[PDB]
């Protein structure tokens, strides 16, 4: 039996899709083991609830890097200090990884993009290593093209626009949409980490990508041809698996409710929430709003919008909501897992990128896929300063445009097209089904 070990970084947005990939492999009679840490194991245990996914717990050296003992997850490492400590900590997992690989000798290692050294670690035992990023072909390409060509240095002001080189679409961006650790005050740590991450894509056996060919064929090709990567598109992997707010939505018109949610880990301050609430009231749209009370809500808000607006404070069933008939739009931060869920439900999106690769995802959604509307946020930042809050006016304009604005029904039509393409890609005979079959056969044949 083939054995593949999966090693995601301790972040919810990488762990859940990695589990789905493990399940996809398992359903093909492949032995799948996921490496995690003790305080993160509960995520996998809950989502396991079918072939057996095995877990292996590594000790996370929080004390050695000066982190609180309870900080085993990227989401809890808030601030440059804590984040650099977190990445030093995860780099220190290399010894446990090499011990586990020597002990078990699996046929393949699928390792998170944040572990470039994992390539060499697997090479010590002649094991091929695959990179998993968890984002779109487009972001992979655009990030690599920006790193290589640095078109942000041909610019005089923060909002001066430049095109992305080589791309078959003209994509205009400003250096505000890039991290200041690249264009303003160059800090060698992040630059080196990025260099090594992007290099691992060519030094390794190849890249697994959570996308489907028909979604972004130009960039599925660009990644392989112009950028030289060996890759397999096997997404959306969440389709492998396939209530109060639902009963609420049942009595609503089809495609009439806006869903607002900013991802698994939301760092969101009271002034921003207050602007969102005011914009929601002014827009008149029915809505489900997922929040992490007079400190951020207008007086009488929840009662003044009762029956029309619903605030969810806990973990929301995002997929069940998005695919309910009543939901017509999605205000999102453009994380790739949420973006892909919006696409798979066929739901247009208001794009509100914050950090990471989300501005590239926003360009993919708005300019290329033509299923979204920008809210107007254009400043890359880990934490939000009060000086950067998006005001209620832009939010209301975007909420209006996404529901009844120009092309809204066409966006719905395009998204339903993408929805059918997504479901077809993963069914037997589909592009993603076939690429997964091909990857597994190649792994069987290795040496
Ligand atoms: O109330 C809730 C709130 C969330 N969820 C689920 O959590 C997921 C949110 O994923 P999303 O990509 O938007 O945020 P996150 O995964 O942290 O993004 C990082 O990881 C991504 C993957 O690399 C990356 O693209 C991104 O830039 C990073 F920020 C998504 O699968 C939802 O279904 C829910 O079910 N109920
Ligand atoms: K090249």
Numbering used by the authors: 7 to 55, 62 to 254, 271 to 320, 330 to 484
Q: Which passages does the manuscript contain on this structure?
A:
PaGT3, a uridine diphosphate glycosyltransferase (UGT) from Phytolacca americana, is known for its ability to glycosylate capsaicinoids and other phenolic compounds. PaGT3 adopts a GT-B-fold structure that is highly conserved among UGTs. However, the acceptor-binding pocket in PaGT3 is hydrophobic and large, and is surrounded by longer loops. The larger acceptor-binding pocket in PaGT3 allows the enzyme to bind a range of compounds, while the flexibility of the longer loops possibly plays a role in accommodating the acceptors in the binding pocket according to their shape and size.
The crystal structure of PaGT3 with the sugar-donor analogue UDP-2FGlc was determined at 2.20 Å resolution. UDP-2FGlc occupies the sugar-donor binding cavities in all three PaGT3 crystal structures. Compared with the apo PaGT3 structure the same loop is seen to shift outwards in the UDP-2FGlc-bound structure, and it shifts further outwards in the capsaicin-bound structure due to the binding of the larger capsaicin molecule. The loops Cys289–Ile297 and Val412–Lys429 shift towards the pocket in the substrate-bound structures compared with the apo PaGT3 structure. In the substrate-bound PaGT3 structures, the indole moiety of Trp352 flips ∼180° to form a π-stacking interaction with the uracil ring of the sugar-donor analogue. Similarly, the side chain of His370 rotates ∼120° to form a hydrogen bond to the O3A atom on the α-phosphate moiety of UDP-2FGlc. The side chain of His18 is likely to contribute to stabilizing the sugar moiety by forming a hydrogen bond to the 6-OH of 2-fluoroglucose. His18, Gly19 and Glu87 stabilize the sugar-donor analogue through water-mediated hydrogen bonds.
